[PDB]
Amino acid sequence: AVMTPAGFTDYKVADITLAAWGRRELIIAESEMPALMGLRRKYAGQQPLKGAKILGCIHMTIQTGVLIETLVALGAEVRWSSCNIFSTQDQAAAAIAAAGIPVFAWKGETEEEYEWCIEQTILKDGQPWDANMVLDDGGDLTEILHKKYPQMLERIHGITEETTTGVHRLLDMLKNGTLKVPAINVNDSVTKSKNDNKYGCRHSLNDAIKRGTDHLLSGKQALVIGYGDVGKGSSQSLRQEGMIVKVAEVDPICAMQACMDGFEVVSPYKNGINDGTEASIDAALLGKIDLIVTTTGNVNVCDANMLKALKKRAVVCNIGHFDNEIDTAFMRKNWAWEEVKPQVHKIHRTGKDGFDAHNDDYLILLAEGRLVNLGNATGHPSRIMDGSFANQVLAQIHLFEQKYADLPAAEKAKRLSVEVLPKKLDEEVALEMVKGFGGVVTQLTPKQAEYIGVSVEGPFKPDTYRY
Amino acid sequence: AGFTDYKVADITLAAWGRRELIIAESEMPALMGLRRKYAGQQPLKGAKILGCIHMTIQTGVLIETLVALGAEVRWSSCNIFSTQDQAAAAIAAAGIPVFAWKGETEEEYEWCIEQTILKDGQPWDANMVLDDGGDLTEILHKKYPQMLERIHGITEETTTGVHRLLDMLKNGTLKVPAINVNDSVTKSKNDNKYGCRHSLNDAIKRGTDHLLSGKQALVIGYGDVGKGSSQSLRQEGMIVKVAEVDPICAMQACMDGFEVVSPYKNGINDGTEASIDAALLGKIDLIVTTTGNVNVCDANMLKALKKRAVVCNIGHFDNEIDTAFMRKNWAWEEVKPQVHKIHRTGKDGFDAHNDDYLILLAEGRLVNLGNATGHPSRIMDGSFANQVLAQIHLFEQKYADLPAAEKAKRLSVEVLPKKLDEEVALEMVKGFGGVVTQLTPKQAEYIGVSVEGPFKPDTYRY
Amino acid sequence: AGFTDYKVADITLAAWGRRELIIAESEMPALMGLRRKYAGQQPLKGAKILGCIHMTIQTGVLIETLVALGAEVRWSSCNIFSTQDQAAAAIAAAGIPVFAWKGETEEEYEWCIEQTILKDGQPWDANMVLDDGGDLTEILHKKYPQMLERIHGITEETTTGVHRLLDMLKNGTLKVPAINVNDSVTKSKNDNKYGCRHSLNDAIKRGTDHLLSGKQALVIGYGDVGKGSSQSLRQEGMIVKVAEVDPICAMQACMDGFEVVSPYKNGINDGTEASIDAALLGKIDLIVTTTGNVNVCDANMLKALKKRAVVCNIGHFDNEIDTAFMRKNWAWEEVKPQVHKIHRTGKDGFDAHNDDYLILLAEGRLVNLGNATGHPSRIMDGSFANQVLAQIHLFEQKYADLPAAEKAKRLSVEVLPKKLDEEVALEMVKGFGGVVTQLTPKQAEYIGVSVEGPFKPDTYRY
Amino acid sequence: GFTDYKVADITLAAWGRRELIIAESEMPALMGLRRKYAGQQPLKGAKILGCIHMTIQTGVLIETLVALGAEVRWSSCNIFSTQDQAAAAIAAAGIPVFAWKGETEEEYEWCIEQTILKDGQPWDANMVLDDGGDLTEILHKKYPQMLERIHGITEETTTGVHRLLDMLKNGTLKVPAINVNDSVTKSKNDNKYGCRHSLNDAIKRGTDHLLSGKQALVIGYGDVGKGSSQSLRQEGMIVKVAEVDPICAMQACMDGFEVVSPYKNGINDGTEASIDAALLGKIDLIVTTTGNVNVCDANMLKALKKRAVVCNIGHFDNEIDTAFMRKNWAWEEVKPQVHKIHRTGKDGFDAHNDDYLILLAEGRLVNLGNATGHPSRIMDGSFANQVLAQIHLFEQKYADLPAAEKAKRLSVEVLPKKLDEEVALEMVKGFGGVVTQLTPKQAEYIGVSVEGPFKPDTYRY
Numbered sequence A: 001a002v003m004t005p006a007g008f009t010d011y012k013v014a015d016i017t018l019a020a021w022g023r024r025e026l027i028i029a030e031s032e033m034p035a036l037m038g039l040r041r042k043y044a045g046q047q048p049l050k051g052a053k054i055l056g057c058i059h060m061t062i063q064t065g066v067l068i069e070t071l072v073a074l075g076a077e078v079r080w081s082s083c084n085i086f087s088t089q090d091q092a093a094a095a096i097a098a099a100g101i102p103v104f105a106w107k108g109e110t111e112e113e114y115e116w117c118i119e120q121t122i123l124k125d126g127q128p129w130d131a132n133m134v135l136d137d138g139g140d141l142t143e144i145l146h147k148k149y150p151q152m153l154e155r156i157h158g159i160t161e162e163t164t165t166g167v168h169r170l171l172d173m174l175k176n177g178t179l180k181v182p183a184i185n186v187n188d189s190v191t192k193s194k195n196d197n198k199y200g201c202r203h204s205l206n207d208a209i210k211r212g213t214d215h216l217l218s219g220k221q222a223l224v225i226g227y228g229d230v231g232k233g234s235s236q237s238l239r240q241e242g243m244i245v246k247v248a249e250v251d252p253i254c255a256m257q258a259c260m261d262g263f264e265v266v267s268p269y270k271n272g273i274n275d276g277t278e279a280s281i282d283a284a285l286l287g288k289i290d291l292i293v294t295t296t297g298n299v300n301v302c303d304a305n306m307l308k309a310l311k312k313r314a315v316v317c318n319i320g321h322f323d324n325e326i327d328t329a330f331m332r333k334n335w336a337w338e339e340v341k342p343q344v345h346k347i348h349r350t351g352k353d354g355f356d357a358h359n360d361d362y363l364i365l366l367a368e369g370r371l372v373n374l375g376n377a378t379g380h381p382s383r384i385m386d387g388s389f390a391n392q393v394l395a396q397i398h399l400f401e402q403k404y405a406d407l408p409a410a411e412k413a414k415r416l417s418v419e420v421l422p423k424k425l426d427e428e429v430a431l432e433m434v435k436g437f438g439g440v441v442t443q444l445t446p447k448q449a450e451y452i453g454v455s456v457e458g459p460f461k462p463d464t465y466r467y
Numbered sequence B, C: 001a002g003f004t005d006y007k008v009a010d011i012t013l014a015a016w017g018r019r020e021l022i023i024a025e026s027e028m029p030a031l032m033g034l035r036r037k038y039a040g041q042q043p044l045k046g047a048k049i050l051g052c053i054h055m056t057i058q059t060g061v062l063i064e065t066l067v068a069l070g071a072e073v074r075w076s077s078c079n080i081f082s083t084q085d086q087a088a089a090a091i092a093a094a095g096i097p098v099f100a101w102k103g104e105t106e107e108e109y110e111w112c113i114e115q116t117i118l119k120d121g122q123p124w125d126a127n128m129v130l131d132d133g134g135d136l137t138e139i140l141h142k143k144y145p146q147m148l149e150r151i152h153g154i155t156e157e158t159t160t161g162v163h164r165l166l167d168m169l170k171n172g173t174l175k176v177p178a179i180n181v182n183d184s185v186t187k188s189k190n191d192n193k194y195g196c197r198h199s200l201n202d203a204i205k206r207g208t209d210h211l212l213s214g215k216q217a218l219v220i221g222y223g224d225v226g227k228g229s230s231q232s233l234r235q236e237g238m239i240v241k242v243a244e245v246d247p248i249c250a251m252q253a254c255m256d257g258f259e260v261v262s263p264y265k266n267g268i269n270d271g272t273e274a275s276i277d278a279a280l281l282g283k284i285d286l287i288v289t290t291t292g293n294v295n296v297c298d299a300n301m302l303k304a305l306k307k308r309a310v311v312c313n314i315g316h317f318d319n320e321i322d323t324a325f326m327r328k329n330w331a332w333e334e335v336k337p338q339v340h341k342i343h344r345t346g347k348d349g350f351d352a353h354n355d356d357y358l359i360l361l362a363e364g365r366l367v368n369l370g371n372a373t374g375h376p377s378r379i380m381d382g383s384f385a386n387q388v389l390a391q392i393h394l395f396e397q398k399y400a401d402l403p404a405a406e407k408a409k410r411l412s413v414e415v416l417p418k419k420l421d422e423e424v425a426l427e428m429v430k431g432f433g434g435v436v437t438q439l440t441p442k443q444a445e446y447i448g449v450s451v452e453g454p455f456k457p458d459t460y461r462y
Numbered sequence D: 001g002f003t004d005y006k007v008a009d010i011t012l013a014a015w016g017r018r019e020l021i022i023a024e025s026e027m028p029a030l031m032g033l034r035r036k037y038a039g040q041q042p043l044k045g046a047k048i049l050g051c052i053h054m055t056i057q058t059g060v061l062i063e064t065l066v067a068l069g070a071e072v073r074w075s076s077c078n079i080f081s082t083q084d085q086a087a088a089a090i091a092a093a094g095i096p097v098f099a100w101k102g103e104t105e106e107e108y109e110w111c112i113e114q115t116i117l118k119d120g121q122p123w124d125a126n127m128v129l130d131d132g133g134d135l136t137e138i139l140h141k142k143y144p145q146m147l148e149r150i151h152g153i154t155e156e157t158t159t160g161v162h163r164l165l166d167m168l169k170n171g172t173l174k175v176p177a178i179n180v181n182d183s184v185t186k187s188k189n190d191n192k193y194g195c196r197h198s199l200n201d202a203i204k205r206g207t208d209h210l211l212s213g214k215q216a217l218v219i220g221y222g223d224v225g226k227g228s229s230q231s232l233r234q235e236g237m238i239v240k241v242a243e244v245d246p247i248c249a250m251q252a253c254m255d256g257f258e259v260v261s262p263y264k265n266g267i268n269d270g271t272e273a274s275i276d277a278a279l280l281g282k283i284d285l286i287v288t289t290t291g292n293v294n295v296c297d298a299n300m301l302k303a304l305k306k307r308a309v310v311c312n313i314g315h316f317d318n319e320i321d322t323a324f325m326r327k328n329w330a331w332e333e334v335k336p337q338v339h340k341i342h343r344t345g346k347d348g349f350d351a352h353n354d355d356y357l358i359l360l361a362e363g364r365l366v367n368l369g370n371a372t373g374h375p376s377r378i379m380d381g382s383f384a385n386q387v388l389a390q391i392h393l394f395e396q397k398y399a400d401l402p403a404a405e406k407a408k409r410l411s412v413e414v415l416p417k418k419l420d421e422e423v424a425l426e427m428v429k430g431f432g433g434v435v436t437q438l439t440p441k442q443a444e445y446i447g448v449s450v451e452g453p454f455k456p457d458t459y460r461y
């Protein structure tokens, strides 16, 4: 801890005594993250982020710790918070704080504390920090800067946004003329969206359900709402455990994939028509479901009438970014909550004021409806987050080097956009991931590269390719 | 009566073909929905379509849909081994010109395409092209440019055919616009992937009746076809290894649970026998090429493969495998049609009990169509609904009638709009009995879409 | 040549059959290892075996192994649709009496068995029996009881035949000892399970070419055949439901990831239409019977099934499905051999475009053998190695030559010892390239076994 | 004023009670027996010494035995398998239990002794419930006079049954036993599917490692090895299987696994030269499943790929040569039950060394050591069998028989198939499954009764 300043107090975490444990897990995670550690080795000497001052808002996990220390190793200063009240690993936050890095994050924040933590990254010594870069996951830091600290955006060169919901929010701002700095959509790298969003939930959804309930999943009935990247991975997390999985969708193309993948496609509503009434609920279907998982990024996809119709003792959880996928407000207003342990509540449908300890008519809600993989387990594993976070590092370097905030107004207008990283970098990330598994990629011969019209070094696919 | 404008193996198979067409109509709700929707409107009235695609039962439903919508057609297969003779006979017996049989020679294959191009010794008054792989498109450009002046567009089925169109567009040699039917999601991520998942193990079983469980496979490629092929084998219990040049596709294969390997030491294909990973290839019981590229199962790989391995290709063209080396150097024993033992002991004769042979399926041609029946009707429903929609769109645009200045503005290779892709998918889902949920207006607003779609930005990869 | 003591479809298929037998030899290392180990010793010299089992390529390798070890045989198939005509031709062309073709009538089936029993109009001097399903055993006991005075034993292949032997034993009507080959682990938990995994989806694809992914299946039974059948369908992407009467087998299906359902409300089959779960059956695209029981897909079930559902049976006998009801009430339209549409609109004729029909495969007879080729050689290797060892063991015991007092002590139905089961399994493992580890002396002492094996008590269930 | 217990923290009792109430809803066969038999009190007078993992599932078992009339004194059969909230809930209910997660070996033995002795003297025990045979061995070696008054032993697990059969062969077994392990609703439920659920669970909790795409070697392919291999293959691991039994190896091949040996040609001669170093150098995870000794040995451990995970899911830790690692290599605790073992030497280690292995649960049963063992709905089958076996042996009253009758009854037996099927039926109904009833004609056709049993005793499922 020689580089940690004497007297360092610029952080807030649950328990600094967990730092040695966190450092032990960071060292393991470094060995599981070859793309990110390869960027650390390749660029540390060039210091491409020297002068960068990064506000970061993303789940304060061990994986985020390796990301933070990579940005620091490349020259950046950072101030960090989590993007969810339940997703921090307190040992990761402690290790980062013990390293002299400002971090405001603990598992089990209240909503007021969550906002306070973001504000502590924004303000240093009671005044706006001279931030010049933003790294966000979900858009909450982006929103607070645009609404409450707009003058800070005059000095910021860009935003790198991690997740589908956050990208949607950026595109709405761009369309409405309210986005003030350019952004890189990190989500839509293939080594992010088709790795993290899908395989990460495959690994971590059944993990969180087991840790929270220890329920056998084999032989039971699950309903997965959504079949995008998260819904695909979630459905596989459950099917590979032997659940009988049904899938709901509004997108007929994603529904077609679910059929061909071996799932029955059903709707909570008769004929698919959500008219707001109890009569619209397919009560026979919902009365057979043992587990419902929301994956949509949309609002109220597990609604009050579905919750009333669910089979007794069903588990309810959400793995989309925000908890408004499930009408938990209805359950707080009408039913009695019994905490089993942190992030596991029985919700007794017998009434609001009390409950019988042996009542059989309850639901189990995980993580109070917040992202369940991070809330009840540890989110995605290091070797998957390697892809997402190598993209984050490259996106930070790119936007920082472009220096948007220094441009004249005429140049700024030409560069105010939301872009993705070029395919060549997506491929280079992927190659490091494959080498991490010991995989061996074949090199095209010159004749073969000519035959298919590509360079031997790639890129290997047109930009239209969907993988 | 009096209809002779066709060439098939056996016209007497027509009644059988018609029975299977009627079954296939029940398996193809998107395509049959287009028949019902557009029959009275006759949107293809006046269309004269040169068609070149595998003359299967599924293609028969496509042909009769085009005809029911008003078109005239003249048809050939795009592969020497892919025709189902009962399908060809049923089409010929319906009065539709078709020149196709299973087991054509290369010369007969070319003659069949020419019989679609020429009627009564003169260029037919064609105005539309439907192609799978680009062979008919190439012949028109090289040999019949004057016909292309009167053709409104090409609708191209498959990855390799689209690649050939883009080369022509790049070189300024493409003469008419095209729709890339391959890259509809209800084509590429249905047909190319799940179709091969269904039909690869099918063709191997029909050709060899080999147990696949417990044996080692190497799949060359992990694009859409390689993904579906690897699953076809893994779901049977094979231990599947995957080779790739694209590291993103290789990453997917690792995450999907496959070991990623190369036939060459350190992935370097330097042409020498020393570069071959002989220990790896000596353990492989089955190799499948899926790339659309050239010579990805080469002579040195074939020399190194384990005795009695099966060799096949599911890409469009047989040059994925160096079959020419095998014809020059090794003795071929036909087991039955489209199944050959290749004896590595020499070129002139073999011991009937020799143990050192490979089994090649379909002489290296597309194995699912050559040794089985290709993709099933319910999957081809997606591909062929897109084909019908693409034919309607290009025919209505009437490119051949536009002034030169407008042609220059419209000469391109495009995909169908996402809204149409979604409408095809919805009929496919309904066919399974699936129930798609309707967004409320507030939910549609929340995610920025209309309640009727499209539901995803054009950048979305699914 | 000049051999005429046979009846097959087409003797000219013999060369093709021999090509496939030579391939099959390379896929059957346990059976060919017995052929090698014992050919010099001639342990079946003097044996005269009546054989009744599906006349497939795999059975041909079994027949030629028995002959190579010294036996004479006379052979028939145990099912009207299971013969591979090229296999029958090759065996006949080798000078071996075989009476078998694909597509026998029931009368021809019985005639073929009688042609093995009789030689030149008189009972052959048979002294051994190999049976699959018990039909030959039954005919001998009822119609030719004097022949059993010379027969040393019966080796019975399958679950249904063993049940028939045990019923005779319980009733005191069994006249010679038997080996239950079915219940070797390398038979029951290899052939019955994994063989159906390989061949059920194979037969459905060849008969219909239907996409299976995404569709609903109901498998009746979850014994060894039901377990393998359920996997055959699930691995293709079917949504599989399982019915069972045995709660332990049902518990396995639940844990294996299947929903357990009954065709009858609350599981009570009272014979009324009101007892049918019409909502369940109206959603089923495919039903497969696997039970060895009677009328498990009954008339009321057939009436309630979803339009265009496929109906098939993979148990030994066709009475699992009430096909008699369908012959009496509904109109049958042959699509192609072993594939019938059964039109529920009535008995006298049908509309060619009628949508209210079911598709029955193999007329309800064993579907993997009827519509495909049954189990693959590498699986049948285990079953047929056990058959050869069982024939050697009973032939050497010479039961028919014993004094009546020693006959009483040896009249039983027994299984082969576990040591032989293990030795068969070892050859199967080596065929995949698998490497079995050898216990150290201290480890063998620790778990209480010999380094040689057997490794498990006889109670062990695997 | 109840003090006859020792647990980590009695204040965890309310949490444990909340989890027991959930578990009751997941255990329909066991709770069905509790409801059926509580009024008849079939275990009134039974005094059961119990030694089995003190989990929430075992808590539901204990409370069922008590509800049926039994008194019990309880310990865990493993130093790391107790869930402290379950032990607290049982002690708070007034039931003697001596168990905590993280016992030393000395404490483990003291805990079993506290069940045997009450107030310094042998308790008036008359029944034994054991998992692995440790309590059974102590009674036979040290308290034979207590066995004179004990009616029987109900033994949970494969290893314990083997030890019983050894005693029976040697003529040293003193009371009859029921082999609970070999009910189909135990062996082919718990041993297989329980490990499928809980092996990947424990590896994720210990390491948070991605498993997809990586290489695993599973030693053994019996029931535990079958379930373990599936636990990893369903996560996307590339799984290789080792076996000494060719029949189990045949199953692994047909199940889609490559069957390999750690030793060249399978010959384990004790030397480094016998190790397939190329194979072991590719393995990211090794799992032992055998019930045998030293199946992941020192030379295998030296040859394993850097950073590989090593764990055991068989009953005893001697499947892995952890003693070699303690003697030669430096151990760095990551967190409880997770250790990095640095192959650079014994004295110390560099915190950033790359040449280490990760050992879970110090080689003890990993599913219980690093997670919570099998889930309630699977343990339902095992523990309903245990309850039935206790009732059966207690009713037979072997200890009160004349010497001549004892000699006739001294055996190790399984429960009848009819009971196995009735347990299975409650399990199926718990999933909402509907079993079909045979018609009289169908029952006649296949030669069974409509009510079962449905299979001969030889049937293997």
Ligand SMILES: NC(=O)c1ccc[n+]([C@@H]2O[C@H](COP(=O)([O-])OP(=O)(O)OC[C@H]3O[C@@H](n4cnc5c(N)ncnc54)[C@H](O)[C@@H]3O)[C@@H](O)[C@H]2O)c1
Residues within 6 Å of the ligand: A163, A164, A165, A166, A196, A197, A200, A201, A225, A226, A227, A228, A229, A230, A231, A248, A249, A250, A251, A254, A295, A296, A297, A298, A301, A319, A320, A321, A322, A371, A372, A373, A374, A379, A380, B437, B439, B443, B455
């Ligand atoms: N928990 C995690 O670790 C994690 C990881 C990545 C992303 N996410 C979040 O998960 C959410 C989903 O992300 P994604 O990448 O899968 O997005 P996506 O757009 O690929 O998929 C969302 C899907 O929801 C479907 N949908 C929308 N409304 C629906 C409704 N009412 N009923 C049924 N289906 C409906 C859409 O058709 C779409 O296919 C986002 O909030 C994203 O930020 C979470």
Ligand SMILES: NC(=O)c1ccc[n+]([C@@H]2O[C@H](COP(=O)([O-])OP(=O)(O)OC[C@H]3O[C@@H](n4cnc5c(N)ncnc54)[C@H](O)[C@@H]3O)[C@@H](O)[C@H]2O)c1
Residues within 6 Å of the ligand: A442, A444, A448, A460, B158, B159, B160, B161, B191, B192, B195, B196, B220, B221, B222, B223, B224, B225, B226, B243, B244, B245, B246, B249, B290, B291, B292, B293, B296, B314, B315, B316, B317, B366, B367, B368, B369, B374, B375
């Ligand atoms: N048989 C069928 O029914 C069928 C169906 C659809 C398409 N196709 C054909 O299959 C081929 C593949 O189509 P696709 O849609 O999968 O294309 P694709 O572009 O999605 O996939 C081809 C893959 O091959 C890989 N590749 C190229 N050269 C390689 C090499 N030397 N070694 C290893 N991998 C290599 C590429 O990186 C790519 O990922 C095309 O010829 C297409 O027309 C056949």
Ligand SMILES: NC(=O)c1ccc[n+]([C@@H]2O[C@H](COP(=O)([O-])OP(=O)(O)OC[C@H]3O[C@@H](n4cnc5c(N)ncnc54)[C@H](O)[C@@H]3O)[C@@H](O)[C@H]2O)c1
Residues within 6 Å of the ligand: C158, C159, C160, C161, C191, C192, C195, C196, C220, C221, C222, C223, C224, C225, C226, C243, C244, C245, C246, C249, C290, C291, C292, C293, C296, C314, C315, C316, C317, C366, C367, C368, C369, C374, C375, D436, D438, D442, D454
């Ligand atoms: N086609 C093949 O290649 C093949 C291979 C082996 C055996 N078989 C035959 O298949 C049949 C089954 O053999 P098996 O070895 O699986 O026998 P098995 O005893 O293991 O299984 C049959 C199962 O059917 C169940 N069952 C009985 N009646 C039922 C009913 N009314 N509803 C639901 N389930 C019911 C039983 O409980 C049992 O579990 C036999 O006729 C056997 O000879 C066929």
Ligand SMILES: NC(=O)c1ccc[n+]([C@@H]2O[C@H](COP(=O)([O-])OP(=O)(O)OC[C@H]3O[C@@H](n4cnc5c(N)ncnc54)[C@H](O)[C@@H]3O)[C@@H](O)[C@H]2O)c1
Residues within 6 Å of the ligand: C437, C439, C443, C455, D157, D158, D159, D160, D190, D191, D194, D195, D219, D220, D221, D222, D223, D224, D225, D242, D243, D244, D245, D248, D289, D290, D291, D292, D295, D313, D314, D315, D316, D365, D366, D367, D368, D373, D374
């Ligand atoms: N952790 C759990 O929750 C749990 C559950 C049930 C049983 N168990 C324990 O797990 C162990 C295994 O039990 P089981 O029921 O699977 O027993 P089993 O007899 O069914 O299987 C053990 C297997 O190990 C194989 N084997 C033995 N020595 C070997 C060697 N040197 N190399 C490779 N394979 C070898 C045997 O051939 C056998 O197939 C026992 O100790 C049992 O008590 C643990």
Ligand SMILES: Nc1ncnc2[nH]cnc12
Residues within 6 Å of the ligand: A058, A059, A060, A061, A062, A063, A064, A200, A374, A378, A379, A380, A381, A385
């Ligand atoms: N482990 C993790 N760390 C950070 N962000 C995540 N998103 C999903 N899993 C995550």
Ligand SMILES: Nc1ncnc2[nH]cnc12
Residues within 6 Å of the ligand: B053, B054, B055, B056, B057, B058, B059, B195, B369, B373, B374, B375, B376, B380
């Ligand atoms: N059945 C089929 N018909 C036409 N084209 C195909 N391409 C792949 N399968 C096909």
